[PDB]
Amino acid sequence: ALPEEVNRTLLQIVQAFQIRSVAEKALSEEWITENNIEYLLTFLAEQAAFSQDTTVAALSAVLFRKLALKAPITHIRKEVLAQIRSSLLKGFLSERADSIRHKLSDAIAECVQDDLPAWPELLQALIESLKSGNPNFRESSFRILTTVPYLITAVDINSILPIFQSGFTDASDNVKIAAVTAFVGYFKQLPKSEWSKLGILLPSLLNSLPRFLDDGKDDALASVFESLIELVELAPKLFKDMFDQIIQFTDMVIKNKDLEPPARTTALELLTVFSENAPQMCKSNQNYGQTLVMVTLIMMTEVSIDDDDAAEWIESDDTDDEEEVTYDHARQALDRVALKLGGEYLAAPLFQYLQQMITSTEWRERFAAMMALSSAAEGCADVLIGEIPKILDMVIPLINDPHPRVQYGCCNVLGQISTDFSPFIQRTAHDRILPALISKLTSECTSRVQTHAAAALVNFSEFASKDILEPYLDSLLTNLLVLLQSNKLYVQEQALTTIAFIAEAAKNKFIKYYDTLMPLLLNVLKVNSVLKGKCMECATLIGFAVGKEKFHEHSQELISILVALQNSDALRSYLEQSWSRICRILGDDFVPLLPIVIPPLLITAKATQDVGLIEEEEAANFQQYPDWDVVQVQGKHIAIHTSVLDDKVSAMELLQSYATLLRGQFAVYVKEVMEEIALPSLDFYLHDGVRAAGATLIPILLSCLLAATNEELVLLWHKASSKLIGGLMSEPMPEITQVYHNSLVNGIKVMGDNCLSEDQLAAFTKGVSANLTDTYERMQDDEYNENEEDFTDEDLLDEINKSIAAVLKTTNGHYLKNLENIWPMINTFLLDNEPILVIFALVVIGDLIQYNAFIPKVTECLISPDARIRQAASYIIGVCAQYAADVCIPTLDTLVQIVDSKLEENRSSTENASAAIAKILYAYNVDTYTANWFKTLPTITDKEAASFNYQFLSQLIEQSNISAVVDSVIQALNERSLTTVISSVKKLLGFLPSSDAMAIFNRYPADIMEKVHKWFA
């Protein structure tokens, strides 16, 4: 179909793939033009179809696929696309190698698009290929259906259903995998309105599963499981009436431990994932939780195979054995499910098993019981927090088990639950936990057990008071000093860390032990980077615990050693946090150490986005590394160095903390950090952590400059605010949008009055609109899915209200004009059924009056079942009578009723309504209305509301209510809601003889009476 000329030229080029680079240039610069692209695509499609050289055909098919997107295939003439399609199809039906038909299939897929004229030759080609006796023909057909799922819509329903049913049952496992892949792929690509069309085939798929176990093909079973895992995340309700069959089948696979791990782990994952996508379905079925618990407990047993003495486990690291895969999966599975379903559902089936396993003569079951409880403790905390002497009655007796890994196992529970059940367990079970853990620190126990007990002491210490730790400290430290003398490095390192965080909790109670520990620490440093890092961490944490004055006995020597260590990646982080910790200790005396500490932080915080314009094949190949991630922006892939950008964030966080502590002392760096680090970080579109860290950096930097000193502060703020504003109408992540608004408020708070210009205020209104528009759109968005986590929208709308309030305040009103442009959207929120948008709109209006067609909804919102809506509404009515009558006085008995309430959840609402009474009662000044308002006192939660109730109370002054008058003030002060009504009260007590005056305070205890006298005359 091409001139013989063009063929030899292009054949040479494709074959050449000095000689090669000349071909790559020739292709990309000469043969991808408006004048040559059609000839090239025609050529490559012919080579892929007809060439009998393996490499030429393969590359051409690959090249054709890539360049088909870029052209795009749409702008290709009719006569040539027809020839290209027909040649691709002819090559498909010919005899090609498996890999080439795969690449032909991928090439064919690029020629199917709603843009293009219909291609019914392909549909009929696929239908017959699916019946072919060659598995590769059947497999490749499903592959095309996977890449182009809309072809499934094109085939008649009575043809496509038998096709998949034949696919699920096919004698070839490659075909079955491809059939399942295509089936699931249909659901992840098409709208839900198309789902009830292949959905009826799920029973056929599930019924095909037992075949994999009969043929002994568990490897193919794992692949199908993974496809099923994806379907559960898309349409869990589809599994509802065959739920028990899924459960029993996964149970059967997992119990069969003659199978390999992949079939067993994927089966577990399938079971697990139901709890994350259909929690109500799991809870309405007792068989799920029982099976899940039973199956994970079996897998946790699989440890130390062919090693009953655990003589290999005793002799190794305190790191995890990477070979105990099924054990690891079982732990995470139980944890994940418990977190989703809660304690009240699966605490009982869990403990029904734990009671049994605790008494076994097989130590692996005794060990597993401890690990299971450790994994399930957090998710089941709502129940297990109450059964907290019960658990220790099982766990603590196992601490002295003959087998060391059961001992280790027992330490792990006490550690895990010290975190999950904090801070209540520290206050309640310190008498049982600490002696248990201490008894295992002794050197007669094996190294692994000492270390894990010491590790558990870190968990306990984190939320333990210094008063509780105090009588245990000496015994704790004498034991840990022994661990410090171990010949095993990981025992030494754990000893240092345990001591450090025991000291952190002990605080000033640790000054007792400074003189004996610090020289031992210095000795270690003077002579294993992990050791020295943990040692310096221990030294500085002790320093912050005992205080600056005590720390100064070794601080300079400690600092000199730090310098040697720094200029000599775990170590780098230990050194950074040590420097930062010393700054918290020394205060302003850290300033001379800034030239040492800051410059390396500056370098790391200036890292750019290490981007790699990447290509299809050599991706995923980069995904192996945890320090690399790849995403798609608009079609073309990219590869980004995530770790480098994570390090950037960590450095920015340290710079921010130094700036926060030092304040004015840090002003010298403000201009550099703002222009080279903070603001450029906002343009980091492939890492939202950097964007967030850059935003929070801004107000604190300006805060540093203001305290020290200005056109620079104004120029930097104008630059910072403008880029913050500009981010609002562009930022895709709603989470980041919240940070910018929050950053603006904090910035406005710092800069003060008149800090914004007319342009800025207008561009801010644009951003507010786009933020409100996209939030409304997302919130206005089941047969397949069960009915939150979306406080992201609420938190976003939260901060927006504070920015508007802040902007209104700094403009001193003149933002009223700009704010009218977005009232149409504001109005919709107020009159939308949905609570979050209602609350937002109400709060905005309240801030408006602060400086006709909304009163209808507000009065309706006054009696709302939601307290949040009543609070916002009451404030609006109250604020109306404040500095803006035909509505206030009529609603005045509505708010009487709303007041009558004093419950923690609704205490805030009834206190605003209360205050709303007091200023209707102030501007209009009824004496029975005031008597009603008086029994709403005192106001203890809302600060601004209480601030006024007592202001009014002092106006009504400057009978038998005198002790109700006083106590109303006492409770306000003591609850820290109000802060001189005191002056008024003292006068009321003055008009009484002293004996009657003093007896009012004859009901208050010493605590409050101490405050009362430092309050009154």
């Binding site: 995470q332 944890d335 330490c411 010491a454 590790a455 870190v458 968990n459 984190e462 345990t498 965080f501």
Partner: peptide, 5 residues
């Protein structure tokens, strides 16, 4: 040097 899942 702590205990975690």
């Amino acid at each position: 040097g702590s205990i975690k899942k």
